Ligand binder design. Structure first.
Ligand SMILES: [Mg+2]
Ligand SMILES: [Zn+2]
Lengths: 164, 226, 12, 57, 95, 170, 1119, 112
């Protein structure tokens, strides 16, 4: 029945929810606030629960639908896009990577690449970050290289203007 | 143009310019003279009648009550000459005085409208257009593809040219100059791309597909989609 | 033509 | 050329990005070059309303 | 209008050709270094915040300013397609 | 010509028949997807109907539906018109309707697309201006020629880099 | 200042209450102010009665009878202002008395059930649906009757038509095609126009002889005698003719349907239909429509008369039976009441539909309250009409006038069942009957022309929507002060004359005086003049009547003038016209701009916010004044007190002025001294040159207010907090964000400043590996929240004047789901006139400011006073509205004579009278000049020389005398200002009124560099802050195609709109000063190919030699 | 690399249906709410149509550009952004064939 599959339990759940809203419509003259529904439903029913179920109950909408004055309006053009780098972002990655690339070379391919690769290449482990050399040389070069890098980048201000 | 009422004879303004580009049978047509000969007229009560004849033959022309005759008992009438007063159907004039006549009629009949409305546009343009209304013809003596087919005039000048000059065996591809409306002229053309745009996107394709059509891109509409 | 009728008729 | 009067008419504006698009734009699309109409060999840079009125008087 | 546009038009066989020339000349003017010009000494390109147009304002305004002179050569097939870009990098510095 | 018959139904890409998060938490998907499910469900119920055992009437009955379905995605309305459930008696845009349609593809492929470096304002007579030129609001010019400006900012001391030159004008 | 008014046509009766159309309809609609005892039972009460007696008898157990007693609605949930502050729909509560009967002993009466909250009307005539004041526009269509129109294609004979609305309810037609058939069609198929008469009881003999003895067509009636010889059997026979395969036996069931109740309308049993009858055809009515159910034997006093008149229409002159459809006596105007009552009854049926189901569901007798009533239908129904109807719209309060006209305009489209989009030109044209009933100017430009137009001055909807234009009676050569509001139709039976006719009182004055019989201009004699036109005013609409010398302006351009006023923006320096028509007063008054005094008294306190007056009756009331309120369209509405402390007020005198009133008179723009000559090019086609001086004084200046709004949404990622916290960079931008979160009132906001701060979460579900490193490098511990803060959109903002925040514990407000909390920010801004703005006089001269000149050098008169605006002459000839040129002349007079005048519509000022005032003006101008000590310039003399050589001044007369002549002509000498030399030739100048027009949203010059993109279509899209690209249409493509713009066109198709990979490399290339790249394939192309592949077809691009090539870069090869 | 100089529509061979396709959409499973991810093999599956994230893979074994043209050992994801997710095709394998209405209901039944 639904476009977004819903387990049998959620289904009956929804039926009971609907039925209950019906008996509640019966006398208030006020389409029940999600307070009644909780009560009338039973043991573990709360406002967050009902607001949630009825949100899943609404079937989707036609991405293609006649909008405004149905003269010729199709709903799906109005939604923007997120993954795609609006030019502004492509330019970002260019300078960022070129400048990040210049700094990475004029240094020690040691604790800089460790933190560059550990952070920018795979996933986000000080100890498990450096090859054979323990934590003391990690923090040692991480914090001393990271600060010389930052303080000369403070001189020739290229990075300051937060690329983000 | 006009409205069915008594005797409304011509068509003015844009309405006409539509009746012209799109080859159409005017409201109040004018029977043309398929034959070039001499004139003869008759008296009886109901319908009039003009007859054109040469030492060879004569032809009967039914001219009902409303038809005001331009011709008189006595002189010559070239082929496709106005024998009734008013509008002329391009297909008929095509048949009668030839393409040259139709083309020449269309152009000038079109300018008739604009001239009368102050606009002064060069013939050239209307010509370019009309030409395309005859880019196609009809077949009656096959070679490569069966007879009843309407195809592009120059594309046959292609076939006939190489079939009689480079590869022997003169298989004359006999055709019949065909004139078709501006709408139709485009409605059916070489590139399906262009046809998909306006006609029946649904059909245009179906055919283009079955036949494995290679749209050589020439023309701006088709090459723009790309 | 129209699909309900035909099957209905079909098994009925 | 553009049938535009100033009772609130509004015109759009575009930009030639390629050095080519620019080349054509200012060579064969620039106003001050296309003075005679394609419809008639009559000019289109004709002194409109106010100019005549002046030059006439 | 623009300087000797008539003169220019006349120097080509086709209107649309003149456009391609200028555009391709302007292209090269920038890519290989902007000093790739044929007429800089005495009376040349110029802008007024200073007289600094001498360096890089409008590429084609130059192209046209040279083409109007008789030093450049535009052909259908003047010099073989790939050997051109090679000889030009070799002789014009500025990057 | 053996290909006119269908036994393998090409399915249109996914991002082209999105499933998206809207307002409040609403969602929105290309109608095409409800039609697709139509077919896939039927096609599957079919397989299982053959396997379970097969009483004739029921197998054809389904094959019929199936057929119908295969029309639906391709072109809706040529034979009956499919509807999303009670809400909108609307023809689910068929792949056809996508190409041609009221406001379809080749169609709006020629109605227009929006240029990236465009602008529009009220016009006003420019008496001293020469045919050659035109008066353009600097304020407009700035956005219009933004990237051309950015870089030119870097060529001068006004800004260190692009991203800078950007925030400089935000 | 003094007022002198020229025309004398005794204005016999004042103009009607300008909103009665809207006010009275809703009055009769819902008769709630008066007890159910009062007789007016149309509308609600009617719609009620119509569907209340629910008879449900047998299928199981029934005998149901639910009956209506009395309808009562009385206490509004909330009040007007509260309804606007909070999003609320001001509606009154209604619950009528109901008692359900039983076939078993017992009748339970469950008194009240409040179903349906129905909106109320403001005293002005406008509504308040959701936040914005809305209006219900009237409509037009074929009034339910019966007419005979000429047959379609066969030139032969015409056919009859019976029109029954509601939609459900037959549509009859009678046509005779004599080789062997007759045709009467209800739903579609045809049959003999006699089998029916036979059913009713009309036999061949009595029928044929009495009806068509005079009509030989009788022969087609007695033709199929075989069936005409069996009465009641003909009843079953016709049943059989209908087609389902129905039971022959159904005693009197279907006959009932075309009989008494449903299908035939239940409208008034006297006029709503029987009017169209007794006058047009037949005579009586024995029940509303052809109706009866007393003996089983039906009576049809309508079925025979229709054929009676077809035999009559076809055979000669019983009268001349040809009905011109467009006669207003054929077309009805639905007043608000009807429009609501219909949706109210539609709901009643929906209600009565579900209730019937519950007469069977309820177990035993206790089924009165909840068992029978559910308020779900009526609510949705009526609610849908006030908020979703294509007819109810936002009040257009750009200025009171606008908000009024918008209240009283009449549309075509709408229900669809009265007039859709297709049929046009016959309706769109100004029919003859439109006289005093509809304006012929008012309708808007564009496709939707003539279908939508506001009514006229004295136009009034009588009993049933039929605009009656008033016309006074003239018995013999005597004219009366008595008036008859006549129906479209009856207007034709008389010989009517125009008001321009020289009148001595009751005496007509000229033998051969004009009159117009029926749409035909006819020179009649005083003895034939049966009726006379009421006024010049009734002929047009209010909105139009406000034009000075309408008389001299091309009806075409006068339209522009009328619509221009609807676009007038209130200035903080309103000014009445130097020359008015006479309704400015009445407009402001009948519109609810200014605040008038109820009864005589004195004033107590005069605050800037209230005027508590003391009436002589021993009472005193506080009159608040909407200080600064936001109009739907963002124009200020303030009531500026004009009365001082302790003042004896006359009943009905302005206490305060409305948004645009100076002194109880309508005032827009401001009368400005203007020279009417050419300047450089500054006024070329339709450009206007303005004197800087106009800005020195706050002359054209107006206050706007936009209402920026932002919401704290509940994401599953975490609530979006609204806090002063703006995650990434400066306190500089946090200043005016004083209140934690909201911006401080009275702060100057420029484009790009935070109006409100909000914090949402960074990703969709997961954090960022790359952003993980950066944060850690300079400050790991960073708020991973995203800046989503309402900012000042480009364009402009002013100073914040009010703010609204609705948090968690809602008072009595409606917060949408997911919506945690809302934050409104009202901003205000002064708009001093500038080069981009457009101003236009009432005549139609519309134009834009092209240049603001320094008072230093614009045209100056001999005495140092210079002109404010310089209008181009050329704009006058082409267009034909000399009226402006006439205004300027009277204006010049009023300038020196320091007086304003009132020139009525066509009776107003006359060329001699103006030349007369000009004469007086010459003395103020030049008289003081004589005494002040000096005479005439070398300049002044010089221009005279060129003036006589011209022919404007009688050669040989003294300069002093010559200049008088020249002034009387409306022109004076003007010096350059830049040179001080004179402008060869006298130039007219004067006090012309000119308004400033409202700046639409589009106006805000858009401009987009890069921005969003649609999800499915990859073309540029805007919205909130990024402008959105411009459309490149086919017409535009060709433009380029025509040029050799190859690349430029590719660009527009690739890099600029759809080339995904294109636009990207594009930007970047530009950024690195790299000549832009060569276009990749357009997503339009790709989207297509695939859309195409989606269907069996295979589209493969090919090479030089027929071989593949690849558009989809590398994503199509598999795996 | 070479200019596109000719376009061509031609009929679809079922074997070419499959050639363009990736996987078979075999179940009406859009996306299941709890996780807004593609349900089973269904209409949106990542194997069938493609990954939904930049240069990165679904699970993340390989995450940047160095190895841009290779696929993941345990899960299949070759990458350049989700544009692949919008250009790839999947096919449904029909039990007992049916026919194109485009060819059967045009006026001239191309099959008739
Ligand atoms: Mg305009
Ligand atoms: Zn993986």
């Amino acid at each position: 029945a639904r476009t977004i599959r819903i387990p049998v339990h959620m289904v009956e759940t929804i039926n009971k929810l609907s039925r209950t809203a019906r008996q509640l419509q019966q006398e208030l003259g006020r389409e029940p606030t999600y307070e009644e529904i909780a009560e009338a439903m039973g043991p573990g029913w709360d406002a967050k629960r009902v607001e949630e179920t009825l949100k899943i109950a609404q079937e989707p909408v036609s991405l293609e639908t006649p909008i405004g004055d149905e003269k010729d309006s199709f709903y799906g053009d109005f939604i923007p896009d997120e993954h795609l780098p609006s030019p502004v972002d492509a330019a970002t990655q260019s300078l960022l990577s070129e400048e990040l690339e210049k700094a990475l070379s004029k240094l020690s391919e040691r604790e800089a690449m460790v933190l560059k690769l550990r952070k920018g290449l795979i996933d986000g482990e000080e100890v498990g970050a450096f090859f054979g050399v323990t934590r003391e040389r990690i923090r040692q070069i991480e914090n001393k290289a990271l600060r010389k890098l930052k303080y000369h980048e403070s001189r020739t201000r290229k990075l300051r203007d937060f690329l983000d | 143009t006009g409205g069915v009422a008594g005797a409304a004879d011509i068509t003015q303004g844009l309405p006409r310019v539509i009746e012209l580009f799109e080859a159409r049978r005017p409201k109040a047509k004018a029977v043309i003279s398929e034959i070039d000969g001499v004139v003869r007229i008759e008296e009886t009560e109901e319908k009039l009648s003009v007859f054109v004849e040469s030492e060879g033959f004569s032809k009967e022309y039914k001219l009902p009550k409303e038809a005001r005759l331009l011709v008189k008992d006595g002189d010559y009438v070239e082929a496709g000459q106005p024998l009734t007063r008013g509008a002329i159907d391009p297909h008929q004039l095509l048949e009668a005085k030839g393409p040259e006549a139709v083309e020449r009629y269309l152009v000038e009949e079109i300018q008739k409208v604009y001239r009368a409305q102050g606009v002064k546009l060069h013939d050239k343009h209307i010509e370019i257009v009309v030409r395309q209304m005859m880019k196609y013809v009809e077949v009656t003596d096959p070679g490569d593809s069966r007879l009843l087919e309407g195809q592009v005039l120059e594309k046959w000048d292609v076939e006939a040219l190489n079939e009689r000059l480079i590869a022997e065996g003169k298989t004359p591809v006999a055709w019949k100059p065909l004139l078709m409306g501006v709408t139709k002229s485009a409605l059916s053309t070489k590139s399906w791309l262009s046809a998909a745009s306006f006609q029946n996107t649904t059909h245009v394709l179906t055919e283009a597909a079955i036949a494995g059509k290679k749209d050589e891109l020439i023309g701006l509409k088709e090459n723009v989609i790309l | 033509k129209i699909s309900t009728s035909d099957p209905v008729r079909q098994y009925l | 050329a553009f049938n535009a009067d100033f009772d609130g008419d509004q015109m759009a504006v575009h930009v030639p990005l390629s050095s080519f698009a620019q080349a054509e734009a200012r060579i064969q699309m620039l106003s001050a070059h296309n003075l005679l109409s394609p419809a008639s060999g009559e000019p289109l840079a004709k002194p409109s309303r106010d100019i005549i009125l002046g030059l006439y008087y | 209008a623009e300087p000797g546009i008539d003169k220019l038009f006349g120097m080509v066989d086709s209107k649309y050709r003149l456009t391609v020339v200028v555009a391709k000349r302007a292209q090269q003017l920038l890519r290989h270094g902007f000093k790739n010009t044929v007429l800089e000494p005495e009376e040349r390109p110029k802008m007024q915040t200073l007289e600094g147009l001498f360096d890089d304002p409008n590429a084609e305004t130059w192209a046209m300013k040279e083409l109007l002179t008789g030093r450049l050569v535009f052909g259908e097939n003047l010099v073989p397609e790939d050997r051109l870009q090679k000889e030009m990098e070799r002789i014009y510095p500025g990057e | 010509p053996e290909w006119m018959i269908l036994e393998a139904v090409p399915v249109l890409p996914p991002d082209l028949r999105p499933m998206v998060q809207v307002d409040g938490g609403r969602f929105a998907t290309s109608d095409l997807n409800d039609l697709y499910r139509r077919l896939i469900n039927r096609n599957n119920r079919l397989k299982k109907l053959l396997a379970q055992g097969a009483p004739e009437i029921i197998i054809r009955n389904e094959k019929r539906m199936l057929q119908e379905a295969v029309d639906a995605l391709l072109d809706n309305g040529r034979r009956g018109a499919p509807v999303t459930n009670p809400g909108s008696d609307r023809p689910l845009r068929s792949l056809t309707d996508i190409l041609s349609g009221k406001q379809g593809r080749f169609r709006q492929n020629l109605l227009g697309k929006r240029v990236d470096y465009s602008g529009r304002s009220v016009i006003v007579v420019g008496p001293q201006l020469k045919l050659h030129q035109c008066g353009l609001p600097k304020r407009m010019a700035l956005e219009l020629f933004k990237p051309f400006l950015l870089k030119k900012m870097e060529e001068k001391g006004i800004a260190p880099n692009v991203k800078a030159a950007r925030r400089m004008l935000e | 200042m003094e007022i002198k008014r020229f025309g004398r046509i005794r204005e016999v009766i004042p103009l009607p209450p300008l909103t009665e159309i809207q006010v009275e309809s809703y009055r009769r609609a819902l008769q709630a102010d008066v007890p159910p005892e009062k007789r007016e039972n149309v509308g609600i009460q009617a719609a009620f009665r119509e569907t209340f007696p629910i008879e449900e008898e047998d299928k199981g157990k029934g005998g149901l009878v639910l009956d209506f007693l009395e309808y009562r609605l009385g206490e509004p949930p909330f009040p007007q202002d509260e309804c606007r502050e909070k999003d609320l729909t001001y509606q009154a509560p209604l619950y009528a008395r109901l008692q359900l009967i039983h076939k078993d002993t017992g009748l339970i009466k469950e008194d009240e059930v409040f179903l349906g909250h129905i909106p109320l009307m403001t005293e002005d005539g406008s509504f308040i649906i959701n936040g914005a004041d809305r209006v219900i526009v009237s409509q037009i269509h074929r009034s339910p009757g019966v007419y005979f129109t000429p047959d379609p294609a066969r030139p032969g004979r015409y056919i009859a038509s019976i029109i029954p609305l509601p939609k459900r309810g037959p549509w009859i037609d009678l046509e005779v095609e004599p080789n062997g058939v007759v045709s009467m069609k209800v739903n579609k198929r045809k049959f003999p126009l006699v089998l029916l008469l036979r059913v009713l009881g009309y036999d061949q003999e009595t029928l044929a002889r009495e009806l068509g003895a005079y009509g030989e067509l009788v022969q087609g009636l007695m033709d199929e005698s075989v069936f005409a010889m069996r009465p009641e059997e003909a009843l079953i026979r016709l049943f059989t003719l209908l087609r389902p395969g129905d039971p022959p036996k159904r005693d009197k069931a279907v006959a009932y349907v075309y009989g008494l109740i449903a299908d035939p309308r239940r409208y008034d049993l006297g006029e709503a239909g029987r009017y169209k009858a007794e006058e047009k055809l037949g005579i009586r009515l024995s029940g509303r429509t052809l109706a009866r159910f007393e003996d089983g034997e039906f009576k049809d006093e309508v079925f025979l008369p229709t054929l009676r008149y077809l035999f009559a229409l076809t055979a000669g002159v019983p009268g001349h039976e040809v009905d011109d459809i467009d006669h207003l006596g054929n077309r009805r105007i639905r007043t608000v009441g009807e429009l609501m009552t219909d949706q109210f009854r539609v709901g009643l049926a929906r209600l009565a539909r579900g209730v019937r189901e519950r007469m069977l569901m309820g177990s035993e007798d206790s089924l009165t309250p909840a068992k029978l009533v559910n308020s779900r239908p009526l609510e949705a129904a009526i609610r849908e009409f006030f908020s979703r109807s294509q007819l109810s719209q936002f009040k257009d309060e750009t200025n009171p006038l606008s908000s009024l006209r918008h209240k009283r305009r009449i549309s075509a489209l709408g229900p669809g069942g009265l007039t859709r989009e297709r049929a046009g030109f016959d309706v769109r044209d100004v029919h003859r009957t439109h006289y005093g009933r509809i304006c012929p100017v008012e309708t808007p430009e564009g496709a939707n022309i003539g279908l939508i137009t506001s009514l006229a001055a004295y136009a009034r909807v009588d009993e049933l929507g039929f605009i009656r234009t008033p016309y006074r009676r003239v018995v013999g050569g005597v004219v009366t002060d008595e008036v008859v509001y006549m129906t479209a139709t009856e207007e034709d039976r008389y010989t009517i004359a125009q008001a321009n006719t020289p009148l001595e009182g009751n005496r007509i004055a000229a033998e051969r005086v004009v009159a117009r019989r029926k749409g035909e201009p006819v020179i009649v004699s005083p003895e034939e003049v049966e009726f006379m036109d009421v006024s010049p005013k009734q002929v047009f609409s209010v909105n139009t009547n406000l034009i000075p010398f309408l008389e001299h302006d091309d009806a075409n351009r006068a339209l522009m003038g009328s619509n221009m006023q609807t676009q007038a923006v209130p200035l903080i320096r309103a000014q009445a016209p130097v020359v008015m028509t006479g309704l400015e007063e009445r407009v402001v008054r009948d519109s609810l701009a200014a605040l008038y005094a109820e009864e005589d008294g004195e004033v107590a306190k005069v605050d800037g916010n209230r005027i508590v007056v003391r009436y002589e009756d021993g009472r005193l009331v506080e009159y608040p004044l909407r200080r600064f309120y936001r109009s739907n369209q963002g124009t200020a509405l303030d009531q500026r007190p004009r009365v001082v402390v302790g003042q004896r007020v006359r009943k009905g005198d302005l206490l305060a002025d409305g948004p645009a009133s100076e002194n109880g008179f309508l005032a827009l723009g401001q009368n400005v001294l203007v020279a009417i000559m050419p300047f450089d090019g500054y006024n070329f086609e339709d450009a206007i040159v303005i004197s800087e001086e106009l800005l020195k004084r706050d002359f054209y200046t107006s206050i706007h207010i936009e209402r920026y709004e932002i919401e704290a949404r509940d994401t599953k990622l975490g609530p979006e907090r609204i806090t002063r916290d703006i995650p990434h960079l400066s306190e500089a931008a946090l200043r005016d964000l004083d209140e934690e979160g909201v911006v401080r009132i009275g702060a100057e906001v420029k484009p790009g400043d935070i109006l409100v701060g909000r914090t949402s979460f960074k990703g969709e579900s997961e954090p960022t590996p790359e952003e993980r490193l950066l944060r850690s490098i300079f400050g790991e511990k960073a708020r991973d929240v995203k800046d989503t803060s309402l900012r000042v959109p480009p364009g402009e903002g002013g100073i914040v004047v009010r703010t609204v925040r609705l948090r968690r514990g809602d008072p009595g407000v409606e917060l949408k789901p997911g919506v945690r909390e809302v934050v409104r920010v009202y901003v205000a801004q002064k708009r001093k006139l500038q080069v981009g703005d457009k101003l236009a006089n009432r005549h139609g001269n519309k134009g834009v400011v092209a240049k603001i000149l320094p008072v230093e050098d614009m045209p100056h008169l001999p005495d140092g006073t210079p002109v404010d605006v310089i209008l181009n002459p050329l704009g006058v000839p082409s267009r034909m509205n000399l009226g402006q040129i006439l205004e300027t002349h009277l204006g010049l007079a009023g300038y020196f004579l320091g007086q304003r005048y009132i020139s009525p519509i066509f009776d107003g000022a006359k060329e001699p009278e103006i030349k007369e005032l000009l004469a007086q003006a010459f003395e103020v101008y030049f008289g003081k000049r004589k005494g002040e000590g000096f005479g005439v310039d070398k300049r002044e003399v010089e221009v005279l020389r060129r003036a006589e050589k011209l022919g404007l001044v009688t050669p040989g007369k003294t300069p002093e005398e010559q200049l008088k002549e020249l002034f009387l002509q409306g022109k004076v000498v003007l010096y350059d200002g830049r040179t001080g030399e004179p402008i060869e030739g006298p130039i007219v100048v004067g006090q012309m009124f000119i308004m400033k027009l409202y700046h639409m949203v589009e106006d805000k010059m858009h401009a987009r560099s890069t921005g969003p993109y649609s999800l499915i279509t990859q073309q540029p899209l805007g919205g909130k802050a990024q402008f959105g690209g411009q459309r490149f249409g086919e017409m535009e493509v060709w433009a380029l195609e025509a040029y050799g713009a190859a690349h430029t066109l590719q660009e527009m198709l690739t890099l600029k709109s759809d080339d995904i990979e294109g636009r990207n490399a594009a930007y970047e290339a530009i950024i690195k000063g790299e000549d832009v790249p060569e276009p990749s394939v357009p997503e339009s192309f790709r989207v297509l190919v695939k859309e195409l592949q989606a269907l069996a077809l295979d589209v493969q691009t090919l090479d030089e030699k027929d071989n593949p090539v690849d558009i989809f870069e590398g994503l199509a090869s598999k795996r | 690399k070479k200019e596109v100089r000719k376009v061509r529509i031609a009929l679809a061979s079922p074997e070419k249906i499959r050639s363009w396709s990736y996987g078979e959409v075999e179940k009406p499973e859009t996306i299941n709410y709890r996780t807004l991810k593609p349900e089973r093999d269904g209409l949106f599956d990542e194997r069938i149509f493609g990954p939904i994230k930049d240069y990165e893979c679904a699970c993340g074994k390989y995450k940047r550009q160095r190895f841009e043209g290779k696929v993941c050992e345990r899960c299949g994801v070759e990458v350049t952004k989700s544009i692949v997710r919008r250009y790839r095709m999947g096919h449904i394998e029909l039990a007992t064939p049916a026919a194109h209405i485009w060819f059967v209901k045009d006026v001239p039944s191309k099959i008739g």
